[PDB]
């Protein structure tokens, strides 16, 4: 019926009157702030904190927890639902972390959703403006489809490296930031395939199939030492804090930043390709989004923990060193691609300047934070020793 059948307490005369009659004449407490007891990272409490902090039911025996008692149900053997034992790192309070961007689900999907639709329009303009006409056939069929297409699995692998962390993180603020770091990675991977799928639609004869890129990844040479580092950070690491740290503050900051930015984002232009750099723009904005959180977690919080500063800083340097090597190995194996580029596309003087940029940045954004002594020269020379 036009009026319907269900009567509603807010609008139904009889029911609403009963509700109104039962109402007090003033709120039974003037304190209307849902996260009032939470200690602000900034001047005022943000919606981000009120909605996130302490949603995890940890007891006090887990740094920061506010509940009490053992869990109600545990793993066969007795393993706690969550516990201190799942990470080498120790802290005064696991709830100290704060995403500099204050990203909860809402803002998070709002931004990626805008990007998705911005992306869709971009592709329709690009195709209608016929920009594909100025793109180098070789670069397209060989470097974007094969090598770039194969890097899809690199990002994809770094994504899955977040599965355990999504299950073991010791706090809500760390769990959300972490899940977003992983989601952004799968995003990029799917974006590399999106481009390949696009090209297929406007470039007859272009196969979107992963077949080619996959084989270059699984049984290739360019990304051999690379895949080994990924299969390691993902399946061989069991400490959630080691995966997040190692991946975002070691592997991906060196190998990843060099490949995405110092190779494609830098060479794609010279081949009349404004398409790929469009997606690499996203992956780089994302990288910088994550980095702020990854720094706030492992440095501001852990590395600078008022009681375990020394401890963590040591364990991290330990990881920094444990992975800096597999990283370096994955970078030199990448060099074998520079001899694939048409003769006269890039001299080593550049590679040295770009290879030094990935390292230098890494040093100012990570290594120097945990007081890890890194030698720019030895690093650069090491990966170079595999070049051409």
């Amino acid at each position: 019926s036009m009026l319907g059948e269900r009567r509603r307490g807010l609008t139904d005369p009889e029911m609403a009157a009963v509700i109104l009659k039962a109402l007090p004449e003033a709120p039974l407490d003037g304190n209307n702030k849902m996260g009032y007891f939470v200690t602000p990272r900034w001047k005022r409490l943000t919606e981000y904190e009120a909605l996130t902090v302490y949603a995890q039911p940890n007891a006090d025996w887990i740094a920061g927890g506010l509940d009490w008692g053992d869990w109600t149900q545990k793993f066969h053997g007795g393993r706690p639902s969550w516990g201190n034992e799942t990470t080498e790192l120790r802290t005064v309070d696991w709830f100290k972390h704060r995403d500099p961007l204050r990203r909860w689900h809402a803002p998070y999907v709002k931004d990626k959703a805008e990007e998705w639709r911005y992306t869709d329009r971009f592709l329709q303009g690009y195709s209608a403006d016929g920009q594909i006409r100025a793109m180098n056939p070789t670069w397209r069929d060989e470097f974007i489809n094969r090598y770039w297409g194969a890097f899809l699995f690199n990002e994809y692998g770094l994504f899955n490296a977040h599965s355990q962390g999504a299950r073991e993180a010791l706090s809500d603020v760390t769990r959300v930031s972490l899940a977003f770091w992983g989601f952004d990675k799968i995003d990029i991977a799917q974006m590399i395939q999106l481009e390949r799928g696009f090209l297929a639609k406007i470039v007859p004869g272009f196969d979107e199939s992963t077949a080619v890129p996959k084989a270059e990844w699984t049984n290739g040479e360019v990304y051999k030492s690379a895949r080994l580092a990924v299969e390691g950070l993902w399946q061989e690491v069991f400490d959630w804090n080691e995966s997040a740290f190692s991946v975002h503050a070691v592997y991906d900051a060196l190998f990843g930043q060099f490949v995405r930015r110092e190779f494609f984002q830098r060479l794609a232009p010279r081949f009349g390709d404004n398409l790929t750099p469009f997606f690499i723009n996203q992956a780089q904005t994302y990288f910088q989004i994550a980095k702020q959180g990854v720094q706030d977690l492992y440095y501001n919080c852990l590395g600078d923990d008022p009681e375990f500063s020394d401890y963590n800083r040591t364990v991290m340097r330990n990881w920094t060193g444990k992975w800096l090597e597999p990283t370096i190995a994955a970078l030199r194996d990448f060099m074998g691609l520079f001899a694939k580029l048409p003769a006269g596309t890039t001299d080593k003087e550049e590679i040295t300047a770009s290879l030094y940029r990935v390292v230098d940045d890494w040093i100012e954004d990570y290594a120097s934070r945990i007081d890890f002594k890194a030698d720019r020269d030895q690093i650069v020379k090491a990966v170079l020793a595999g070049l051409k």
């Binding site: 120790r90 690491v237 020394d310 330990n318």
Partner: protein, 168 residues
């Protein structure tokens, strides 16, 4: 001074834990604490309300010391005792796949936790064990889970049945 989060029995252990300044007895004391105060097989339940918190406050001190008194290679392959992480994991899994029943398997897993739980064993190997050890325990346990009548099951567990009330 009674309390749930802050109480004498707790202030007592931090006072005690503070005296520690050598990874030696620290590591040893953690294992003891675990043997007496954790799991159904604990030696006592006098710390029932505070053991979880103290255990962690203990693990902390053991971590800081083990970090300063360990080289990088060992810190991730050698236990706080001196043992070789891997060798242990593989031994405990070797024995677990040997157990002739849930009852045996059960004791291998629980004992494993009490002994090598970090900061003793490196987390990587510990959870790696937790994967295999837990898989064995469950496989045996969940096999014909309901066939054994409660009466008989109760004798197997060996509980002191203190009271039974059932109108049906």
């Amino acid at each position: 001074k009674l309390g749930i989060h802050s109480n004498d029995t707790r202030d007592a252990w931090v006072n005690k834990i503070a005296q520690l300044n050598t990874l030696e007895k620290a590591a040893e004391m953690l294992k003891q604490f675990r043997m007496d105060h954790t799991t159904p097989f604990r030696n006592s339940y006098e710390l029932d309300n505070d053991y979880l918190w103290i255990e962690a406050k203990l693990e902390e001190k053991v971590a800081v010391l083990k970090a300063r008194a360990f080289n990088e290679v060992d810190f991730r392959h050698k236990t706080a005792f001196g043992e070789d992480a891997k060798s242990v994991l593989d031994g405990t899994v070797a024995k677990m796949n040997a157990a002739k029943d849930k009852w045996e398997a059960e004791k291998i897993h629980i004992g494993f936790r009490q002994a090598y739980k970090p900061p003793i064993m490196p987390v990587n190997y510990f959870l790696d064990g937790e994967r295999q050890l837990g898989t064995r325990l469950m496989e045996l346990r969940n096999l014909n889970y309901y066939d054994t009548p409660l009466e008989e099951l109760r004798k197997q567990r060996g509980v002191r049945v203190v009271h039974l009330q059932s109108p049906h």
